Amino acid sequence: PNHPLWYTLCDRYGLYVVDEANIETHGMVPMNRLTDDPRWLPAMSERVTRMVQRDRNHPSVIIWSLGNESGHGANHDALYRWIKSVDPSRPVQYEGGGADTTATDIICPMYARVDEDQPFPAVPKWSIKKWLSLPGETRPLILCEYAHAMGNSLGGFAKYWQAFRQYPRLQGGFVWDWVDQSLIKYDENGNPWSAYGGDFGDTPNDRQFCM
Amino acid sequence: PNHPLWYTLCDRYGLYVVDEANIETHGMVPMNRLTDDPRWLPAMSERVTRMVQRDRNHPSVIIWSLGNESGHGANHDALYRWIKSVDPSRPVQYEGGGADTTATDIICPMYARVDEDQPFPAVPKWSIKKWLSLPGETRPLILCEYAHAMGNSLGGFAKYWQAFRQYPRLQGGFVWDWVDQSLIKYDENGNPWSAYGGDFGDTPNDRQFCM
Ligand code: NA
Ligand code: NA
Ligand code: NA
Ligand code: NA
């Protein structure tokens, strides 16, 4: 959840918002170790419920998200249902555990390609065009992350947009991402420079992957 | 319906068969003028019912077809239901009137392209990958005719097969067609040559479009 003013500005300027619970457990092995554990249900529930109680009157919020990269666990299913129960006015999405689980109203993969399948075990990233028409699948598809804009990038961006316009159920996506997470440091002359991972003696670190 | 020996041979050698009613009214304007007319229902029903009564014990016959190029009329809907009622063992298909009407269990277009839409009014030929995922659509797609093999042709055949293999619900199709409809004529010396439309004094005629 963002600083409270963000939503007011999105209401007044006009931007659709996905409001997202502060739950990410990416570093667990496997990813759902905590989110499938009922002992962590209370902590997770507060991060979802208190978000909804705070932000439910903002028109700019159109979709609730259960968080990010925390696999898929039974706690997600419980909290998916909690939101559906308390606020039927908004769809609920969540990408973890393969992007099309029972905890999401929207097929919302990250970096699924336009034409190319990536058949990873358990959590494949199907071509988005193919994903829509998998046996029994009916949901809309909106990428929670796509077109990774790291440095000299966005090659193939036009390919996504051509597909979005051709396929009714391909309803777009959210580019990753808006702004480089660089921080300002100062050299011996006092001149500013843009710093990334490692530049603060932080270790281990993932270098420029924050930009 | 074919010569009776054909089904026996397909049973024994092993070929899946679509058994098709002798109903085509292509030249009508519009194409469904007779097939939407209750006065033509009796003549139409016999072409369907007597086919079913004849061929229903052949294992090779796996799909019934209501005919070809006769638009979509209420008579198709009635006859579709008649088959479903008398023989639940086989799907019923029919391409007329847009290839995805209420008279077909299978989306069965002719000459729908792999990637390229052909948005004709009333009867569009969607990209086959797109067609599958149109809002609410769930059926399998098998082209009743594709890859028109007229003369020096079958360009882009590999594109179909790549798509058939990638998409579960794209289940193939039937090439148009097997054999040139050329006829033998003899020159002054009695030497045989291959004849087509118009070569018999027949007029009007459509020339080589039979090959
Ligand atoms: Na779209
Ligand atoms: Na990053
Ligand atoms: Na297939
Ligand atoms: Na022809």
From Swiss-Prot, chains A, B:
Chain residues that bind Mg(2+) 1: E24, H26, E69
Reported impact of E69H: Slowly inactivates galactosidase activity by reducing the binding of magnesium. It increases binding specificity
Residue sites binding substrate per the record: E69, E145, Y146, A147, H148
Assembly behavior: Homotetramer.
Positions that bind Mg(2+) 2: N205
Active-site residues annotated for this sequence: E69, E145
Gene that specifies this protein: lacZ
Binding site for Na(+): F209
Name used for this protein in its record: Beta-galactosidase
Top-level taxon: Bacteria
Induction description: By allolactose.
UniProt record similarity statement: Belongs to the glycosyl hydrolase 2 family.
Portion held of the full protein: 394 to 604 of 1024
Organism lineage: Bacteria, Pseudomonadati, Pseudomonadota, Gammaproteobacteria, Enterobacterales
